[PDB]
């Protein structure tokens, strides 16, 4: 996202406003205002590593924008927006992630490598790999008889079509000692 | 649901795995460590686009 | 299949470690374990 102080009305703020969001989802319900729209209106912009050097990025927007002129115990502990010098906003932190990783649920609650495993193991899982599976003559393939979408999901799963072509089943699970088997 | 982006060569689907490399035409200075007659070096790997 | 089409190889002073610059471009987590650890990255 692009940030400018560009506001007679108050402080520093993202070019993108809730109006564009309306205009965006207008075109979503129609399944005019594309991504390329945001990109030529200059509300949003491409940044490589080199250019990244010379900017300052807000994590969340809303949270990291208006100052201050009680707090949730259970929640994590976020720093702040003490800076006024913002140039850009992160669209959403969860996109620092890759495909495989974007299936791991609550991965921000795991020992760092427990993620690195599952983001390799899921590539050895089983399910519906393409809907034309019946007509393909691949040398080796496995399909799950009754795949289920997962009960716990990622917003990013939406784009990976994971709900529409899953990898497992929701098993009623007990964590218990039993027969020692 | 197929996303494409692959090739079909003799039946089997091939993917071209992206290759990483140092960018060229770029100026970089490095310290050449202890045993060297040289102490610092400025390289540029230069090439026609 | 997806994750295979967002895959990067990096042949051959310290390539394997997760660099700061890799923020937002490469997955911090999705790498092979072993001979190609951190050498095969995923976008």
């Amino acid at each position: 996202f692009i940030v400018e102080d560009d506001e007679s009305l108050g402080h520093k703020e993202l070019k993108v406003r809730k109006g564009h969001i309306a205009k965006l989802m207008a075109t979503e319900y129609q399944d005019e205002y594309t991504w390329s729209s945001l990109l030529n209106e200059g509300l949003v912009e491409y940044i490589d590593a080199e250019e990244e050097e010379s900017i300052l990025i807000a994590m969340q927007p809303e949270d990291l924008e208006p100052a201050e002129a009680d707090v949730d115990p259970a929640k994590r502990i976020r720093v702040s927006h003490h800076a006024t010098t913002f140039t850009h906003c992160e669209i959403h932190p969860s996109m620092i992630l890759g495909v495989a990783a974007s299936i791991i649920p609550f991965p921000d609650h795991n020992q760092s490598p427990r993620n690195t495993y599952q983001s390799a193991m899921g590539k050895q899982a089983m399910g519906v790999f393409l809907t034309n599976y019946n007509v393909r003559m691949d040398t080796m393939a496995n399909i799950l008889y009754y795949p289920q979408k997962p009960l716990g999901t990622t917003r990013a799963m939406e784009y990976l079509k994971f709900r529409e072509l899953p990898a497992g089943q929701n098993a009623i699970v007990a964590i218990a000692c039993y027969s020692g088997y | 649901f197929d996303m494409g982006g692959y090739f079909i060569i003799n039946g089997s689907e091939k993917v071209l795995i992206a290759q990483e490399r140092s960018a060229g035409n770029i100026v970089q200075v490095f310290k050449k460590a202890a045993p060297s007659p040289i102490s610092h070096v400025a390289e540029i790997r230069s090439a026609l686009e | 299949t997806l994750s295979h089409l967002r895959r990067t190889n990096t042949p051959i002073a310290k390539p394997r470690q997760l660099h700061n610059t890799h923020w937002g471009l490469v997955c911090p987590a999705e790498t092979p374990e072993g001979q190609a650890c951190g050498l095969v990255k995923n976008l």
């Binding site: 996202f1 703020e13 993202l14 993108v16 406003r17 809730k18 109006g19 564009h20 969001i21 309306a22 965006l24 989802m25 075109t27 979503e28 205002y33 594309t34 991504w35 390329s36 945001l38 949003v44 969340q60 927007p61 809303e62 949270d63 924008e65 208006p66 669209i91 959403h92 996109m95 495909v99 917003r155 939406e158 784009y159 990976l160 | 996303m3 494409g4 982006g5 692959y6 071209l16 992206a18 | 997806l2 089409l5 967002r6 976008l43």
Partner: peptide, 30 residues
């Protein structure tokens, strides 16, 4: 108020339209 500040949940809408355009294999194609 079509020029209001944008909330966190709103970013997804943008992210949605990103993939409408590029899809998951943007790079390989382009």
């Amino acid at each position: 108020d079509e020029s209001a500040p944008i909330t966190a949940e709103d970013s997804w809408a943008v992210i949605s339209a990103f993939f409408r355009e590029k899809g998951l294999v943007s790079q390989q194609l382009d």
